[PDB]
Design a protein around this ligand. Structure first.
Ligand SMILES: *Cc1c(C)c(=O)n2c(=O)c(C)c(C)n12
Ligand SMILES: [Cl-]
Ligand SMILES: [Cl-]
Ligand SMILES: [Cl-]
Ligand SMILES: [Cl-]
Ligand SMILES: [Cl-]
Ligand SMILES: [Fe+2]
Ligand SMILES: [Fe+2]
Ligand SMILES: [Fe+2]
Ligand SMILES: [Fe+2]
Ligand SMILES: [Fe+2]
Ligand SMILES: [Mg+2]
Ligand SMILES: [Mg+2]
Length: 310
């Protein structure tokens, strides 16, 4: 009959309620509890973007919809989704342990971040595989990147085309597309990490499919460590390009992110919008994929291609 396979869907995680902010950020900060002013700031930011709990639901919806779509579009494998998160329960290791307890012996994994990096994707995949090895009798084949899946490129291409079509003529003629992902420490370059190259390729593919000749690649959401992070940051890039050529509209495609979270709804829709409001340009940031059918179909195609079934 149908072969059973685990579908390990991995992501960063989000707090589930305001009282989870402390523990989630302590985890991201490697055990350093945020000071009270930062905790208050973070709560205010989540309030300003409409609340925490919707953000927390998106990953679950993505995993659910992906499982059901994969099971509909082919007839050989029955997938069961398990969510494994980096910074809050259910953790990657919990998910693998659950797959093992449930009798899964073969799984495929995907990280809900389309570009490979050594800091994120490789670390999630290594955590999942090490837990599988420790438990024994369960193997995981892991997607490493998927930014170049044509269906995923097309998601963003069509959103960009719609945004440009929506602009008044003077904006459309004097607009800049900024394509971004989460910054990482610059030291990843010592490993030959392809993350920057893959962001630039994402940007090339999206601008090309959308027919957008003027675009730039930037990074966002860098951390505070003395070591440099990848730049330029989108806020500085926006101002710099404005000072160079006077763009009247900036379109932000944070292609490294697949769902609403603070690092889009705040780091673009507030922090970049501050800059565009200051320089008098219009701000546009098309919808994140979230759990939209077009994006789920792209992910399902990524998974089936990884398994050689397409
Ligand atoms: C840790 C964290 C925060 C605060 C945020 O907004 N996001 C994302 O969008 C990702 C992918 C991660 C991780 N985080
Ligand atoms: Cl990997
Ligand atoms: Cl891959
Ligand atoms: Cl890769
Ligand atoms: Cl949109
Ligand atoms: Cl859709
Ligand atoms: Fe409460
Ligand atoms: Fe459903
Ligand atoms: Fe479907
Ligand atoms: Fe560049
Ligand atoms: Fe971050
Ligand atoms: Mg590839
Ligand atoms: Mg920041």
């Amino acid at each position: 009959s149908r072969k059973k396979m685990g579908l390990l869907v991995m992501a960063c995680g989000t707090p589930y309620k305001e009282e989870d902010i402390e523990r989630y950020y302590t985890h991201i900060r490697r055990g350093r509890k945020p000071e009270p002013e930062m905790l208050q700031d973070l709560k205010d930011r989540y309030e300003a973007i409409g609340g925490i709990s919707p953000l927390a639901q998106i990953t679950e919806q993505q995993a659910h919809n992906l499982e059901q779509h994969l099971n509909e579009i082919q007839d050989e494998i029955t997938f069961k989704a398990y969510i494994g998160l980096k910074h809050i329960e259910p953790f990657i290791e919990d998910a693998v342990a659950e797959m093992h307890k449930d009798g899964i012996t073969e799984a495929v994994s995907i990280v809900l971040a389309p570009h490979f990096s050594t800091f994120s994707v490789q670390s999630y995949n290594k955590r999942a595989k090490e837990e599988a090895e420790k438990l024994g009798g369960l193997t995981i084949t892991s997607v490493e990147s998927w930014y170049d899946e044509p269906k995923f490129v097309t998601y963003w291409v069509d959103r960009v085309k719609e945004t440009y079509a929506s602009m008044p003529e003077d904006e459309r003629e004097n607009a800049m597309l900024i394509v971004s992902a989460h910054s990482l420490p610059e030291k990843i370059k010592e490993f030959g990490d392809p993350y920057p190259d893959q962001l630039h390729e994402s940007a090339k593919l999206i601008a090309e499919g959308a027919g957008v000749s003027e675009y730039a690649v930037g990074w966002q959401s860098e951390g505070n460590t003395p070591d440099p992070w990848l730049g330029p940051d989108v806020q500085d890039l926006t101002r710099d390009l404005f000072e160079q050529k006077g763009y009247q509209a900036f379109v932000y495609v944070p292609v490294g992110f697949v769902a609403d979270h603070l690092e889009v709804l705040y780091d673009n829709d507030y922090e970049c919008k501050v800059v565009t409001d200051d320089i008098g340009a219009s701000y546009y940031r098309p919808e994140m994929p979230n759990a939209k059918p077009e994006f789920i179909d792209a992910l399902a195609t990524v998974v089936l291609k990884k398994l050689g079934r397409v």
